[PDB]
Amino acid sequence: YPVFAQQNYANPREANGRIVCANCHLAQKAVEIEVPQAVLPDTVFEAVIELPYDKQVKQVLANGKKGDLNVGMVLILPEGFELAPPDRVPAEIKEKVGNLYYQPYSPEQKNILVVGPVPGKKYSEMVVPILSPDPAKNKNVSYLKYPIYFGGNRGRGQVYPDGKKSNNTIYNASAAGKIVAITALSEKKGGFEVSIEKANGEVVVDKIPAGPDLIVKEGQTVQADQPLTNNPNVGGFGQAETEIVLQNPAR
Numbered sequence: 001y002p003v004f005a006q007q008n009y010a011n012p013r014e015a016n017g018r019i020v021c022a023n024c025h026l027a028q029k030a031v032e033i034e035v036p037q038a039v040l041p042d043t044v045f046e047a048v049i050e051l052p053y054d055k056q057v058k059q060v061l062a063n064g065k066k067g068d069l070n071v072g073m074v075l076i077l078p079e080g081f082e083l084a085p086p087d088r089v090p091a092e093i094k095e096k097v098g099n100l101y102y103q104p105y106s107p108e109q110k111n112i113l114v115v116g117p118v119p120g121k122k123y124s125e126m127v128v129p130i131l132s133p134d135p136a137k138n139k140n141v142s143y144l145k146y147p148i149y150f151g152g153n154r155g156r157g158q159v160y161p162d163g164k165k166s167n168n169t170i171y172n173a174s175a176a177g178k179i180v181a182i183t184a185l186s187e188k189k190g191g192f193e194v195s196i197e198k199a200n201g202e203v204v205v206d207k208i209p210a211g212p213d214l215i216v217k218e219g220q221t222v223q224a225d226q227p228l229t230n231n232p233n234v235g236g237f238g239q240a241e242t243e244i245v246l247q248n249p250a251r
């Protein structure tokens, strides 16, 4: 979630350009973003983003069942650019923005916006109203061709802030040995217990949450860290970059 980014990363974009959502949303899926080629200072314009995905395909949810995918994103604009305040947003654009609450990444990064989680079915494509700065009143800005970076995600991540795997990812054998037991963990609550008999005779019990399916059977020999399940992830995070020229009005 964007909140996870904000809570554990001071800056969403790293030196090499990767967005930190990618440290947890481990699958890549294209995204798109479009802004006008140029804009006059102190004027509102639109950033149209798209986080496409097959809406017919459901994902593994935290509770183990299957369900809809939700979306979120992080937008990195040049210093001085910001979310346009409502009073500056023309009605027809508000219409297209809909019911979304773009928030600044932090109070000190108003040029960095985020939104999500929100339903992917409804917000697969979003519009963001941006107010351009004015080089005249802001010494940190000039009449340049500026880059804009975007990170769009749809679907649950593979690992939490603590570094533990979510149930929406691949599970692996903790040790090498013979699977002498696969117990349908909990009563209709999902998950399994896979007992691996190590070569020394010790049995360790791997806990598999409900969601991913098993690809191993009783009596099967697995190598250390060998996969015991499929990869249930159907979502993904994508990055796109664009640019806009801050025009120098003239008279």
Ligand code: HEC
Pocket: 001, 002, 004, 005, 008, 012, 020, 021, 022, 023, 024, 025, 059, 061, 062, 068, 069, 070, 071, 072, 073, 074, 116, 117, 118, 151, 152, 153, 154, 155, 156, 157, 158, 159, 160, 161, 162, 166, 235
């Ligand atoms: C690891 C610390 C994460 C970072 C950094 C980001 N996300 Fe994440 N996200 C993560 C997990 C483990 C999950 C599942 C959480 C749960 O309660 O089950 C999520 C989920 C989302 C969602 C919801 C997706 C859905 O329900 O289909 C969204 C839309 C999402 N994440 C977006 C997102 C964005 C844009 C981020 C970058 C700024 C981001 N996440 C970072 C783990 C982590």
